[PDB]
Amino acid sequence: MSKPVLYYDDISPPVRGVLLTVAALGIKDQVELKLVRLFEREHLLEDFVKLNPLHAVPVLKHDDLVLTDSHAIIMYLCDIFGQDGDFSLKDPKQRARVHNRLCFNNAVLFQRESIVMRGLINRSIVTLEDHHLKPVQEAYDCLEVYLTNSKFVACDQLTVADFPIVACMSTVGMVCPLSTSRWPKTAAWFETMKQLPYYQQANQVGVDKLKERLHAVM
Amino acid sequence: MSKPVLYYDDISPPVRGVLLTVAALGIKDQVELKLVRLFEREHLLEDFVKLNPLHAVPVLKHDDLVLTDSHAIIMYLCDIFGQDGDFSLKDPKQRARVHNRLCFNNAVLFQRESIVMRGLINRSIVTLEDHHLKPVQEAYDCLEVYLTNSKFVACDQLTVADFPIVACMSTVGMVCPLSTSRWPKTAAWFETMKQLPYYQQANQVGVDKLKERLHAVM
Ligand SMILES: N[C@@H](CCC(=O)N[C@@H](CS)C(=O)NCC(=O)O)C(=O)O
Ligand SMILES: N[C@@H](CCC(=O)N[C@@H](CS)C(=O)NCC(=O)O)C(=O)O
Ligand SMILES: O=c1c(-c2ccc(O)cc2)coc2cc(O)ccc12
Ligand SMILES: O=c1c(-c2ccc(O)cc2)coc2cc(O)ccc12
Numbered sequence: 001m002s003k004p005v006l007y008y009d010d011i012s013p014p015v016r017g018v019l020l021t022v023a024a025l026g027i028k029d030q031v032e033l034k035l036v037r038l039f040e041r042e043h044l045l046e047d048f049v050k051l052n053p054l055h056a057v058p059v060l061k062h063d064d065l066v067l068t069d070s071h072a073i074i075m076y077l078c079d080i081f082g083q084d085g086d087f088s089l090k091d092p093k094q095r096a097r098v099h100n101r102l103c104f105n106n107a108v109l110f111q112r113e114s115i116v117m118r119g120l121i122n123r124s125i126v127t128l129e130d131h132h133l134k135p136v137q138e139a140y141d142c143l144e145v146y147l148t149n150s151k152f153v154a155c156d157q158l159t160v161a162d163f164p165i166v167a168c169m170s171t172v173g174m175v176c177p178l179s180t181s182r183w184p185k186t187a188a189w190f191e192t193m194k195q196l197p198y199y200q201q202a203n204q205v206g207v208d209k210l211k212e213r214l215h216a217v218m
Numbered sequence: 219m220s221k222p223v224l225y226y227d228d229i230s231p232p233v234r235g236v237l238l239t240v241a242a243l244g245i246k247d248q249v250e251l252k253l254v255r256l257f258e259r260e261h262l263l264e265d266f267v268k269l270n271p272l273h274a275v276p277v278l279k280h281d282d283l284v285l286t287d288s289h290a291i292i293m294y295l296c297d298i299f300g301q302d303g304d305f306s307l308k309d310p311k312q313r314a315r316v317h318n319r320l321c322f323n324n325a326v327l328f329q330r331e332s333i334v335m336r337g338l339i340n341r342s343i344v345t346l347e348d349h350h351l352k353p354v355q356e357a358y359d360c361l362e363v364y365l366t367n368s369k370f371v372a373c374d375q376l377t378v379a380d381f382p383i384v385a386c387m388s389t390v391g392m393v394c395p396l397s398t399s400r401w402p403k404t405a406a407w408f409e410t411m412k413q414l415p416y417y418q419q420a421n422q423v424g425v426d427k428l429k430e431r432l433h434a435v436m
């Protein structure tokens with residue numbers, strides 16, 4: 001009866017990782033959305049800052065629980081809605097495999113992605129030199145290893161760990177594109193992700209919006 | 219019978235978050251250590267790079283499971299060794315509260331900490347201007363809110379989420395000290411952490427080592 005409320009702006013890759021998860025879990029009707037538009041600065045309103053001192057999206061509120069990181073939101077939603085399905089995290093080693101890749105997205109891929117994208121968005125960077133994209137390419141190399149050792153990022157099955165990564169990969173891809181030559185396992189995985197039926201609505205919409213803003217800044 | 223193996227260098231805050239956890243869980247005898255000395259560049263040896271393409275510590279190997287982020291190592295260890303104790307993560311909301319603060323350490327506190335510490339370690343930064351420490355102070359402000367709303371970082375009880383944060387707080391503290399004036403809840407929490415019986419061995423040893431290296435670079 002109690003519905004989680006997702007505070008979100010789908011231009012954000014972390015948000016889209018959540019939106020992808022909600023869709024894959026089949027719980028779109030079970031999660032209420034509350035738009036928090038970054039470019040309008042609604043994330044700096046007193047109510048939202050009180051909700052999350054990081055003044056960032058996404059945020060999940062469920063009863064009195066407040067999660068302020070897309071990755072914790074994703075694992076929490078798997079725990080309460082996905083325990084008995086294909087995305088289950090009940091097994092401790094499977095849970096750890098998935099969490100390990102969520103950590104990789106949060107602490108490596110999204111960090112390096114964000115540096116570049118925030119730089120362009122706020123005009124701190126004007127020209128992308130190679131040194132801007134080198135950390136992203138190092139993250140691609142790690143991802144290529146992971147996708148050599150298993151079919152998806154965390155194991156041979158799709159898991160929620162694939163969603164934040166693809167959300168990031170489809171963002172920073174527009175400034176640091178994947179080479180099939182250089183990263184064949186990752187390019188193939190990315191195409192497969194793109195074929196998911198909920199990808200268009202849960203991720204591409206927001207990516208296109210961000211592409212509009214990026215073409216405007218460039 | 220199967221023992222996890224922890225690849226570690228205790229100058230690293232992520233490592234010390236693990237060491238603190240292993241001690242708090244009372245499982246020092248149950249986790250084998252394997253030293254991987256960063257300043258000797260043992261993390262760049264072929265075997266270790268194959269183990270972890272991020273060439274970073276800590277790493278946990280348990281049977282064929284390989285975790286390559288201190289935060290995933292911590293949750294995994296809680297799951298297999300702490301399920302029936304004071305650090306249990308069995309309840310989904312408690313698990314999410316703890317994971318949410320682990321995310322905060324991984325993606326905010328340790329990121330901003332690491333930027334500064336790596337800068338000094340490799341002499342990219344020579345003088346700490348205020349702009350180097352401003353992001354760290356913003357992270358302190360968030361932490362002060364969290365510790366206003368609960369006695370420890372994630373709830374009113376000590377949890378494993380307190381250990382990575384204190385590991386970071388005791389590192390970047392040496393260049394950006396806490397003010398009791400400015401962050402009273404956090405200063406009090408930090409002192410309490412320092413009083414834990416395993417703090418000296420699991421965290422202070424490594425902090426002191428790093429202080430030696432930092433005085434050498436400065
Ligand atoms: N580690 C966080 C990162 C969230 C994040 O950085 N969100 C950005 C958008 S991509 C934001 O809301 N930025 C607004 C701000 O920083 O004020 C997560 O995964 O939720
Ligand atoms: N998010 C990772 C970060 C680990 C990390 O950055 N480790 C550092 C030491 S603090 C390292 O081993 N650096 C060596 C390198 O980057 O080559 C975790 O929490 O385990
Ligand atoms: O920082 C980012 C913003 C943003 C944040 C605040 C604001 O006022 C406007 C845009 C929007 O989208 C993003 C997407 C990214 O991939 C990384 C950073 C941002
Ligand atoms: O980058 C860090 C190293 C380090 C990494 C590689 C190397 O060759 C030497 C030191 C050691 O300790 C640290 C502690 C920190 O808190 C942050 C970064 C580092």
Ligand SMILES: [Ca+2]
Nearest residue numbers: 029031032033
């Ligand atoms: Ca509805």
Ligand SMILES: [Ca+2]
Nearest residue numbers: 037039040041
């Ligand atoms: Ca408007």
Ligand SMILES: [Ca+2]
Nearest residue numbers: 046047048050
């Ligand atoms: Ca208000």
Ligand SMILES: [Ca+2]
Nearest residue numbers: 247249250251
């Ligand atoms: Ca032993």
Ligand SMILES: [Ca+2]
Nearest residue numbers: 255257258259
């Ligand atoms: Ca030696």
Ligand SMILES: [Ca+2]
Nearest residue numbers: 264265266268
């Ligand atoms: Ca070898």
